[PDB]
């Protein structure tokens, strides 16, 4: 689904699981 | 003289003079290097229109020009004086004997040789016996010698020509090497502050001879790969700037074998930068920071079958202990 | 700070020599260029008679005599390294001898790349113009149609950029130059006809091509033959239109020819010399025709003998030849017709201290005076020179091999000298010697056996033990193969009472650019035998070593290491300091450490004893070649840099923020005109001014630097400005321009320095002129005041 990271393209199946990955980019 | 130049309000990467760089989009401007007292004049020129019938995608690009040291900002405008290129004469020109002045121009090399540089040293630095230093010491400060020493290591990374590909002007050759090495942001800033091209070449050779290990920038000590595994699959060198579907730029260094990484998900082929290779996001096994991707060949004949592409911003070159 | 520099010994190396009729039309003169000095001699049937020796405000780069149409005697043209051109004339009015300036000007162009082949100054045989090749692609032409006092010129565009050598041709309708240029197709020979009216080049008389790949010398053959002789690496070719002759004598291929000179005025004999010090005779055989046309028949080369490695060469008269040398002693040689077995027999030799690559001050007589022992010469001209004061007494100890570094040990009553001998790879498999040198005639030889790890020449480094009285090679310890000895110190370390000979070396292999392995070998010489007392293997080149408060401070590439002397007589790594620069220059004073690389990177460290490591105090990184460095005091540092400059930087006084105290502000700039290699704290007298520092140069010049008070500096500075008004400049060159800090990019006036040579010349001016330079001068003042302070300034050398 569209819960993939826009920076690297990591596919997460949850809304929260992607927000945690967003921290690993800054 | 100085210039009244505007500032790029949304720039992240520091631009090296002579480096072309796609940008993340949300005639000469300034690009600061925030640690924060230095920067480089970039040129946004791109009106590029590629032709795919009905769709002409417009790509924007900037190219570095001159270095500078910031004086004061004023909201964004920046008054700045350009830092000059310190070009130095030959080391032996001070002590060159008048009788040996005529026998100082050397005939050219049959490009293929390793014994030619032996006679090159004996001739160019012959008057070293007039000084308190040996012949081989002056070679360590010879721009032409330093360039070949750097070119030797770059040929081990990329399998591309040795002719017009690399510039002959040392101030251009130095800036070229600065934009090709897989080095972190503070190292690029340190090279920009360097005034002399000979010093820049000497340090770029130091970085290559010392900083062999590449590790995660976030968690410091976590060896991702080494300089040995570096290779070039894209014809434009081992580290080329790629743009993802959403416009993020990734200076992706391609290496054979990378370690200490975690894969997120299953291989995908959508928008793969290397055609015929399935990318999979890779993360650090300690801090879970994004380091890059792993590319796996879809077909079995492709060579190499597996390799890694690491984004430059997530790496930190370190010297092994 | 404020410093005072005086020349203690004039430059002794000869770089130019010409024969002509300068003093009077009936005299055969021999003019000698000694860097800044110009010596005038008159050739007598007995030898040389000194006439006049002048000093110029410049480095003589060009020196040619010429006779314009309508002149009673020859005129002299001199061009300095700072592009100061001038035309001089000898004037003898009764007993007074004065060199007057006929014309003068600065032929410098703000734009233009100075050619890698140096400055070339040629004059038309019919004395129409002075051709100058200063920058690539440009040929300056100074017309000599008389009354050109300001030396007005005009440049002509040169399509050829890499010009090896250029000279004017004899016997031509219009001015014709002949030059060798290098292009991707190789080296060629071309000629251009100069037209001063159209201010352009015209098609020359003959255009040949493809000459020897290493053709480096053009010789203008006089009228009887004409044309040009092109001396290359292994072939000598004669070019004159469609008459091409080319000989490749095997006798000359062995070495490279570096000087030439015409013997007879019709160009039948020529004197060429090579780098190895051999003298040749180029005999061009002639053949006259029925109409009288003399056509060149053959080219002969005959080896005459061995001179003292010739920089310049000139034939005097009746066999006598002057051999000017930069590497060794200049000499006068007689060319006998019969082989002695060598047609070359010496007549009179002149001492040449240059090049001075290392020196040391030792007061052997314990009288506080001090003898200066310097490493002089190179290759077979290697020597040890002892200079003691009052006049200068010079002991010449020939070593027949290159001396590199020197130090002194009082307990052993002998010197330690790092040296190098050149052996050749014989066909059997070893290295045969070229000539018996000091490292071969020692009383006792030894080799290193640490074992810790086809025809070309190879260096063989040896440590020499030289007695302080007889200067006898007592021992000659040979270092390992491919080992380059770089550092040498003599001191006692730790609590041990013995004094050791410590050597720092580097393992240099031609394939490896940067050395990654070296040795610090500790020796003991006293008991008449040289044995090794333990060694410490390091991971790089040991560039410099010094005794740092009972310990040993070494420099391994980019690391300044501090070694301890344990009870077991071994070096123990106490603390380290890693730098971004290569630790080449190492000097200490107390617990302060001065660091420097080849690029004028001045670093300052201090040993903090409470912790056991060093901490960086300040630094001054300015990219520029640096040849030597020295500590003046705890906050002042002397250094020599490009081009032929001296500089002083100081620890900042207004240290309020940590960013000001971490900087060494440059306060002294001075164009010395010499290339300093060694800085030595010492003095040659037996003693106002504080400090005494000697230095040796490539030209053999030895100078002195001393510090002054701000009050004394401002006093001598105002006197230095007023002496310039009364003292005549040889080429009307301004002193402040000569001493101005000269680099390729920047040019700045002289600051923080006082020219002792100019101050000391105050005592030589007439009494009226003395009362003129004291007008409105106060610490008023009388002439008798300055005569008493300048005389004291002479009591330092
Ligand atoms: C167009 C479809 N899309 C947009 C809407 C959201 C859902 C979907 C996601 C999957 O899209 C992406 C977002 C980021 C990246 C990528 C695709 C691929 N990718 C890199 C990977 C390595 C490589 O070799 N090449 C790249 O481009 C990224 O960084
Ligand atoms: Zn991501
Ligand atoms: Zn990590």
Distance between CA atoms of residues C595 and C744, nearest Å = 25
| C632 backbone φψ class: left, alpha, beta (φ>0; ψ -120 to 50) | alpha
Cα(C461)–Cα(C484) distance, rounded to whole angstroms? 7
Q: Is C264 exposed, middle or buried (0-12, 13-18, 19+ CB in 10 A)?
A: exposed
Number of residues written out for chain A: 26
Adjacency order of strands within the sheet including C29-34: C16-20, C29-34, C37-43, C48-55
CATH at residue B279: 2.170.150.20
Contact C158, C105 (CB under 8 A): no
Residue C658, burial from CB neighbour count under 10 angstroms (0-12, 13-18, 19+): exposed
Q: Are residues C334 and C474 in the same domain?
A: no
Which of A4, A7, A9 most suits a substitution to test ligand 1, by most atoms within 8 Å of the C-beta?
A9
Q: How far is CA B220 from CA B101, B282, B284, B319, C738, in A?
A: 53, 17, 11, 12, 56
Residue of the CA atom closest to atom 23 of ligand 1: B272
Q: Check the annotation: does B287 bind a ligand.
A: yes
DSSP E strands: which ranges in C250-401?
Answer: 257-262, 269-274, 278-288, 294-306, 312-315, 321-324, 330-335, 344-350, 356-362, 371-376, 383-388, 393-398
C333 with C307: CB under 8 angstroms? yes
Q: Indicate the number of domains in chain A.
A: 1
- The beta-strand segments (E) located in C426-570 are 431-433, 444-447, 457-467, 473-478, 483-491, 500-507, 518-525, 530-538, 542-548, 551-556, 559-565
Pocket of ligand 1 (CB under 6 A): A 2, 4, 6, 8-9; B 244-246, 270-273, 279, 293
Distance C47 CA to ligand 1 centre (A): 93
B258 Cα–ligand 2 center, Å: 19
Do C53 and C730 touch, CB atoms closer than 8 A? Answer: no
Structural domain of B229: 223-316
The tokens of C356 are what?
A: 């001075």
Cα angle C378, C380, C385; round to 5:
60
- Separation in Å, CA C490 to CA C229, C358, C563, C665: 54, 15, 15, 34
Instruction: Determine the structural domain holding residue C524 and report its residue range.
Output: 356-712
Q: Quick one: CA torsion of B217, B220, B226, B232, rounded to 10 degrees?
A: 0
Non-local (6+) Cβ contacts of B102 within 8 A are C117, C118, C164, C165, C216, C217
**What tokens does C279 get?**
């003298």
Q: Phi then psi for B170, rounded to 5 degrees? A: -60, -35
C504 & C595 share domain: yes
Do both C540 and C572 map to the same domain? yes
C221 shares a domain with C157: yes
CB B289 within 8 A of CB B237: no
C181 phi/psi in degrees, rounded to 5: -120, 155
User: Chains B vs C: touching, with 3+ CB pairs under 8 Å?
Assistant: yes
Tokens standing for C441? 């005639």
Q: Are residues C326 and C455 both part of a single domain?
A: no
Give contacts of C517 with chain B, Cβ < 8 Å.
none
Q: Are residues C568 and C551 in the same domain?
A: yes
What's the CA gap between C275 and C325, in Å, rounded? Answer: 11
Of the three residues C350, C372, C407, the one that is the final residue of a domain is C350
> Which residues, in sequence order, are CB contacts of C603 under 8 Å at separation 6+?
C579, C581, C594, C595, C596, C616, C619
Q: Give the span between the Cα atoms of C180 and C161, in whole angstroms.
A: 10
Burial class (CB in 10 A: 0-12, 13-18, 19+), C155: middle
Task: Answer yes or no: is B219 a known binding residue.
Answer: yes
Nearest to C277 by CA among C302, C298, C300, C257: C257
**Which residues 121-150 on chain B approach chain C with CB closer than 8 angstroms?**
129-134, 136-141, 145, 149
Residue with tokens 């130091």: B206
Rounded CA Rg of chain B? 22
B206 — phi, psi (to 5°)?
A: -65, -45
The Cα–Cα gap between C350 and B123 comes to 29
The number of angstroms, rounded, from the C-alpha of C253 to the middle of its chain's C-alpha atoms is: 27
Those residues whose beta carbon sits under 5 angstroms from the ion ligand 2 are: A 5, 7-8, 10
Cβ neighbours of residue C530 closer than 8 Å, sequence gap 6 or more? C444, C446, C465, C475, C477, C501, C523, C524
Q: Answer whether the bond into residue C200 is a cis peptide, omega within 30°.
A: no
Q: Do A24 and B265 touch (CB under 8 A)?
A: no
Residue nearest to atom 17 of ligand 1 (CA): A9
C-alpha count within 13 angstroms, C-beta hemisphere, residue C384? 27
Ligand 1 atom with the smallest distance to the CA of A8 is 29
Q: In the structure encoding, which two tokens stand for residue C291, read together?
A: 């109409």
Question: What is the rounded CA–CA span in Å between residue C515 and residue B136?
Answer: 9
- The enclosing H or E element of C63 equals strand C60-66
Whether the Cβ atoms of residue C294 and residue C224 lie closer than 8 Å to each other: yes
List CB contacts (< 8 A) between B293 and chain A: 8
Cβ-based contacts of A24 with chain B (< 8 Å): 283, 287-290
The total number of structural domains in chain C stands at 3
- Answer with the one of C334, C350, C366 that is the final residue of a domain: C350
CA distance B83 to B98: 35
The distance of Cα C65 from the centroid of its chain, to the nearest Å, equals 24
Query: Atom 27 (ligand 1): residue with closest C-alpha?
Result: B244
Element (H, E) at C707: strand C702-708
Give the number of other Cβ atoms within 10 Å of residue C331's Cβ. Answer: 20
First to last CA, chain B: 46
Check: CB of residue C508 under 8 Å from CB of residue C526: no
- Tell me if residue C355 falls in helix, strand or coil: coil
Kindly report the backbone phi and psi dihedral angles of residue C28, in degrees, each rounded to the nearest multiple of 5, phi listed first.
-95, 105
- What the block records as the tokens of C609 is 């004893």
User: Any residues with CB less than 8 A from the CB of B132 and at least 6 apart, and which?
Assistant: C357, C358, C404, C405, C627, C628, C677, C678
Nearest to C104 by CA among C91, C89, C121: C89
Q: What are phi and psi of C717, to 5 degrees?
A: -65, -45
The Å distance, Cα C543 to ligand 2 centre, comes to 51
Instruction: Tell me if B127 is assigned to a ligand binding site.
Output: no
Query: Could you tell me if C316 and C19 are in contact, meaning their C-beta atoms sit under 8 angstroms apart?
Result: yes
Q: Is B274 left (phi over 0), alpha (psi -120 to 50) or beta?
A: beta
Interface test with B, best of C185, C513, C542, C676 (most B CBs within 10 A): C513
Measured between beta carbons, the chain B residues lying within 8 angstroms of C644 are 94
DSSP β-ladder status, B61-74 and C16-20: unpaired
* B 149-188 near C (Cβ less than 8 A): 149
Measured between beta carbons, which residues in chain A are less than 8 angstroms from residue B279? 9
* B211 belongs to an annotated ligand binding site: no
For residues B305 and B284, the answer to whether their CB atoms sit within 8 Å is: no
On whether both C80 and C179 belong to a single domain, the answer is yes
> Rounded to the nearest 5°, which phi and psi values hold at B117?
-70, -20
Candidates C143, C149, C109, C104; CA nearest to C126 is C143
Check the CA dihedral C194-C200-C206-C208 and report its sign. positive
CA distances from C407 to C257, C399, C403, C415 (A): 36, 16, 12, 6
Specify burial of residue B83 (Cβ count, 10 A radius: 0-12, 13-18, 19+): middle
DSSP C769: H
Same domain, C330 and C428: no
| Residue C599 neighbours by CB under 8 Å, 6+ apart | B141, B196, B198, B199, C581, C623, C624, C625, C626
**Closest to C584 measured CA to CA, from C539, C621, C627:** C627
> Which of residues 48 through 107 in chain B touch C, CB cutoff 8 A?
86-91, 93-105, 107
- The string of DSSP letters for C307-331 reads -S--SEEEE-STT-EEEE-SSS-EE
Interface of A with B in 7-26 (CB under 8 A): 7-11, 21, 24-25
Asked whether the beta carbons of C240 and C228 are under 8 A apart, the reply is yes
**Structure determination method:** X-ray
How far, in Å, from the CA of B47 to the mean position of ligand 2? 29
Cα B79 from Cα B6, distance rounded (Å): 8
Closest chain A residue to B310, measured at CA: A8
- Please tell me if residue B196 touches chain C, with a CB cutoff of 8 Å: yes
Q: What is d(CA C583, CA C578) in angstroms, rounded to the nearest whole number?
A: 9
Burial-class residue C732 by CB neighbours within 10 Å (0-12, 13-18, 19+): middle
For C159, which DSSP code? S
**Torsion angle in degrees (nearest 10) through CA of C338, C344, C349, C353:** -170
Indicate which atom in ligand 1 lies nearest the CA of residue B250.
29
- Coil/strand/helix, residue C715: helix
In DSSP notation, C3-43 reads EEEEEEE------EEEEE--S-TT--EEEEEETTEEEEEEE
Contacts 24+ apart (CB under 8 A), C709-712: C709/C2, C710/C2, C711/C779, C712/C2
Q: Please provide the DSSP assignment of C110-145 as one string.
A: SS-PBPTT--EEEE-TTS-EEEEE-BTTEEEEEE-S
Q: What are phi and psi of C215, to 5 degrees?
A: -70, 125
Q: Which two tokens stand for residue C349?
A: 């030799």
Distance B263 CA to ligand 3 centre (A): 14
The angstrom resolution of this structure is 3.2
Measure CB to CB from residue B264 to each of A6, A7, A10 and give the nearest one. A10
Q: Which of C271, C279, C232, C239 is nearest to C253 (CA)?
A: C232
CA B155, CA B188: separation in Å to the nearest integer? 22
| Spatial separation of the C-alpha atoms in residues C693 and C637, rounded to whole Å | 12
Name the residues around ion ligand 3, CB cutoff 5 A. Answer: B 216, 218-219, 222, 284, 286-287, 289
Neighbours of chain C (3+ CB pairs under 8 A): B
Q: Do chains C and A touch (3 or more CB pairs under 8 A)?
A: no
- The DSSP bridge partners found for residue C345 are C334
How much distance in Å is there from the Cα of B215 to the middle of ligand 3? 8
Alpha-carbon dihedral B122, B124, B127, B132, rounded to 10 degrees = -80
CB-nearest to C117 from B101, B136, B198 is B101
Do residues B182 and B289 touch, judged by C-beta distance below 8 A? no
Q: Is B216 annotated as a binding residue?
A: yes
Closest C-alpha to C479, from C443, C523, C528, C545? C523
List C-alpha distances in Å: C489 to B59, C197, C223, C415, C517.
65, 66, 60, 11, 20
Whether A24 and B288 lie within 8 Å, measured CB to CB: yes
Choose from A2, A20, A24, A25 for mutation: most chain B CBs within 10 A: A24
- Radius of gyration of chain A, Cα coordinates, nearest whole angstrom: 8
Q: What are the tokens at C140?
A: 């300056």
| DSSP letter, residue C437 | -
Cα–Cα distance measured from residue C358 to residue B107, given in angstroms and rounded to the nearest whole number: 35
**Considering only CB atoms, which chain B residues are within 8 Å of A25?**
290
Residue from B270, B276, B277 to probe ligand 1 pocket by mutation (most atoms less than 8 Å from CB): B270
Residue C718's φ and ψ, nearest 5 degrees, are -70, -35
Give residues preceding each break in chain C, C–N over 2.5 A: 341, 389, 453, 687, 779
Structure tokens at B192: 């920009």
CATH value at residue C503: 2.130.10.10
Tokens of B7: 């500032």
Contact C454, C430 (CB under 8 A): no
- Between B and C, how many CB-CB pairs are < 8 A? 120
B250 is in an annotated binding site: no
How many other C-beta atoms can be found within 10 angstroms of the C-beta atom of residue B161?
Answer: 9
Of B102, B104, B108, the CB nearest to C184: B108
Nearest CA in chain B to C623: B196
Record: contact B289-A9, CB cut-off 8 A: no
Look at residue C253 and give its three-state secondary structure.
Answer: helix
Whether cis (ω within 30° of 0) applies to the bond prior to C355 is: yes
Residues in chain C, overall count: 797
Q: Helices B170-178 and B143-157 meet at what angle, rounded to 10?
A: 30
How far is CA C248 from each of CA B119, C201, C252, C452, rounded to the nearest angstrom? Answer: 22, 33, 8, 48
Q: What is the three-state SS of chain B?
A: CEEEEEECCCCCCCCCECCEEECCCCCEEEEEECCCCEEEEEEECCCEECCCCCCCCEECEEEEEEEEEEEEEECCEEEEEECCCECCCCCCCCCCCCCCCHHHCCCCCCCCCCCHHHHHHHHHCHHHHHCCCCHHHHHCCCHHHHHHHHHHHHHHHCCCCCCCCCCCCHHHHHHHHHCCCCCCHHHHHHHHHCCEHHHHHHHHHHHHHHCCEEEECCCCCCEEEECCCECCCCCCCCEEEEECCCCCEEEEEEECCCCCEEEEEEEECCCCCCCCEEEEEEEECCCCCEEEEEEEECCCCCCCCEEEEEEHHHEEEECCC
How many whole angstroms separate alpha carbon B63 and alpha carbon B27?
11
Answer for the pair C156, C141: CB distance below 8 angstroms, yes or no.
yes
Last residue of a domain, one of C664, C694, C712: C712
Q: Which of C216, C484, C643 sits opposite B94 (nearest CB)?
A: C643
Cα C510 to the center of its chain, rounded Å: 27
Q: Give the tokens for residue C787.
A: 């005569």
For residues C721 and C703, state if they share a domain.
Answer: no
Q: Which residues contact C590 (CB under 8 A, 6 or more apart)?
A: C549, C634
- Measured between alpha carbons, how far is C367 from A6 in angstroms, rounded to an integer? 85
3-state DSSP assignment of residue C380: helix
From the CB of residue C24, how many other CB atoms can be counted at a distance below 10 Å?
Answer: 13
């Amino acid at each position: 689904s569209l819960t993939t990271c826009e920076v690297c393209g990591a596919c997460f199946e949850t809304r929260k699981g992607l927000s945690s990955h967003a921290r690993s980019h800054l | 003289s100085c210039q009244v130049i505007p500032v790029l309000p949304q720039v992240m990467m520091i631009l090296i003079p002579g480096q072309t760089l796609p940008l993340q989009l949300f005639r000469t401007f300034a690009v600061l290097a925030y640690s924060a007292q230095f920067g480089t004049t970039a040129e946004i020129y791109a009106y590029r229109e590629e032709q795919d019938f009905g769709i002409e995608i417009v790509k924007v690009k900037a190219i570095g020009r001159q270095r500078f040291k910031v004086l004061e900002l004023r909201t964004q405008q920046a008054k700045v004086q350009i830092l000059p290129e310190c070009v130095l004469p030959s080391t032996m020109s001070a002590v060159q004997l008048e009788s040996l002045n005529k026998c100082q121009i050397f005939p050219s090399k049959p490009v293929s040789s390793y014994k030619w540089w032996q006679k090159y040293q004996k001739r160019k630095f012959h008057c070293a016996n007039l000084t308190s230093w040996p012949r081989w010491l002056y070679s360590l400060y010879d721009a032409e010698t330093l360039m070949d020493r750097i070119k030797k290591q770059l040929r081990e990374w990329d399998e591309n020509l040795k002719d017009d590909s690399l510039p002959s002007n040392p101030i251009d050759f130095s800036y070229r090497v600065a934009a090709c090495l897989p080095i972190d942001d503070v190292l690029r800033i340190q090279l920009l502050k360097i005034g002399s091209a000979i010093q820049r070449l000497r340090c770029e050779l130091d970085i290559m001879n010392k900083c062999t290990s590449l590790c995660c920038k976030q968690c410091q000590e976590t060896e991702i790969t080494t300089k040995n595994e570096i290779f070039s699959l894209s014809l434009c060198g081992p580290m080329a700037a790629y743009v993802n579907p959403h416009g993020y730029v990734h200076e992706t260094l391609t290496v054979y074998k990378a370690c200490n990484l975690n894969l997120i998900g299953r291989p995908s082929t959508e928008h793969s930068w290397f055609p015929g290779y399935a990318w999979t996001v890779a993360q650090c096994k300690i801090c879970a920071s994004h380091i890059g991707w792993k590319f796996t060949a879809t077909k079995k004949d492709m060579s190499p079958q597996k390799f890694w592409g690491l984004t430059r911003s997530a790496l930190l070159p370190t010297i092994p202990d | 700070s404020y410093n005072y520099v005086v020349t203690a010994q004039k430059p002794t190396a000869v770089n130019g020599c010409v024969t002509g009729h300068f003093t009077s039309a009936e005299d055969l003169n021999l003019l000698i260029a000694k860097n800044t000095r110009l010596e005038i001699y008159v050739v007598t049937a007995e030898g040389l008679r000194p006439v006049k020796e002048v000093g110029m405000y410049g480095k003589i780069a060009v020196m040619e005599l010429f006779r314009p149409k309508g002149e009673s005697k020859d005129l002299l043209f001199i061009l300095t390294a700072k592009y100061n051109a001038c035309i001089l004339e000898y004037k003898q009015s009764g007993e007074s001898i004065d060199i007057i300036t006929r014309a003068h000007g600065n032929v410098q162009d703000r734009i233009g790349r100075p050619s890698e082949t140096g400055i070339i100054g040629i004059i038309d045989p019919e004395c129409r113009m002075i051709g100058l090749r200063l920058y690539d692609g440009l040929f300056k032409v100074i017309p000599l149609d008389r009354d050109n006092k300001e030396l007005k010129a005009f440049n002509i565009r040169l399509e050829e950029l890499h010009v090896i050598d250029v000279k004017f041709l004899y016997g031509c309708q219009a001015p014709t130059i002949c030059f060798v240029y290098q292009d991707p197709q190789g080296r060629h020979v071309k000629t251009y006809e100069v037209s001063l009216r159209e201010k352009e080049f015209n098609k020359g008389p003959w255009k040949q091509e493809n000459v020897e790949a290493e053709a480096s010398m053009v010789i203008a053959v006089p009228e009887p033959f004409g044309g040009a002789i092109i001396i290359g690496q292994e072939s000598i070719t004669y070019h004159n239109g469609d008459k091409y002759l080319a000989i490749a004598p095997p006798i000359i291929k062995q070495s490279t020819i570096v000087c030439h000179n015409r013997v007879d005025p019709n160009g039948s004999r020529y004197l060429l010399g090579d780098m190895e010090g051999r003298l040749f005779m180029l005999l061009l055989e002639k053949e006259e025709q029925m109409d009288g046309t003399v056509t060149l028949k053959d080219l002969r080369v005959e080896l005459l003998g061995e001179t003292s490695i010739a920089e310049c060469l000139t034939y005097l008269d009746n066999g006598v030849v002057f051999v000017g040398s930069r590497l060794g002693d200049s000499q006068l040689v007689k060319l006998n017709v019969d082989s002695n077995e060598s047609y070359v027999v010496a007549m009179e030799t002149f001492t040449n201290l240059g090049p001075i690559v290392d020196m040391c001050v030792v007061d052997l007589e314990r009288q506080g005076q001090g003898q200066l022992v310097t490493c002089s010469g190179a290759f077979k001209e290697g020597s040890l020179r002892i200079i003691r004061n009052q006049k200068l007494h010079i002991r010449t100890v020939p070593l027949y091999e290159s001396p590199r570094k020197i130090c002194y040990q009082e307990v052993s009553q002998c010197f330690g000298v790092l040296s190098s001998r050149i052996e050749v790879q014989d066909t059997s498999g070893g290295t045969t010697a070229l000539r018996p040198s000091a490292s071969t005639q020692a009383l006792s030889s030894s080799v290193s056996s640490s074992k810790l790890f086809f025809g070309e020449e190879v260096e063989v480094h040896n440590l020499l033990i030289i007695d302080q009285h007889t200067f006898e090679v007592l021992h000659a310890h040979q270092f390992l193969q491919n080992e380059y000895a770089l550092s040498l110190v003599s001191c006692k370390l730790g609590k041990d009472p013995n004094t050791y000979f410590i050597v720092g070396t580097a393992m240099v292999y031609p394939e490896e650019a940067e050395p990654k392995q070296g040795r610090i070998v500790v020796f003991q010489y006293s008991d008449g035998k040289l044995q090794t007392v333990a060694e410490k293997e390091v991971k790089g080149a040991v560039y410099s070593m010094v005794e740092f408060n009972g310990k040993l401070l070494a420099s391994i590439n980019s690391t300044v290491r501090l070694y301890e002397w344990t009870t077991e007589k071994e070096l123990r790594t106490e603390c380290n300091h890693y730098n971004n620069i290569m630790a080449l220059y190492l000097k200490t004073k107390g617990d302060f450490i001065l660091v420097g690389d080849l690029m004028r990177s001045v670093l300052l460290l201090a040993y903090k004893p409470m912790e056991g490591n060093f901490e960086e105090i300040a630094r001054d990184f300015n990219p520029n070649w640096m040849s030597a460095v020295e500590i003046l005091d705890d906050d002042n540092f002397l250094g020599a840099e490009n081009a032929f400059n001296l500089f002083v930087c100081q620890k900042d006084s207004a240290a309020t923020t940590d960013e000001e105290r971490q900087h060494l502000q440059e306060v002294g700039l001075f164009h010395l005109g010499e290339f300093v290699n060694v800085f030595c704290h010492g003095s040659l007298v037996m003693q106002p001014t504080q400090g005494s520092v000697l230095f040796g140069t490539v030209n053999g010049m030895i100078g002195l630097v001393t510090s002054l008070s701000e009050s004394w500096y401002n006093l001598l500075l105002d006197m230095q400005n007023r002496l310039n008004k009364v003292i005549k400049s040889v080429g009307k060159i301004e002193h402040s321009f000569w001493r101005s800090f000269h680099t390729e990019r920047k040019t700045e006036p002289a600051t923080g320095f006082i020219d002792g040579d100019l101050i000391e010349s105050f005592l030589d001016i007439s009494r009226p002129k003395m009362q003129e330079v004291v007008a409105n001068l106060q610490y008023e003042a009388t002439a008798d005041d300055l005569i008493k302070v300048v005389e004291e300034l002479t009591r330092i050398h």
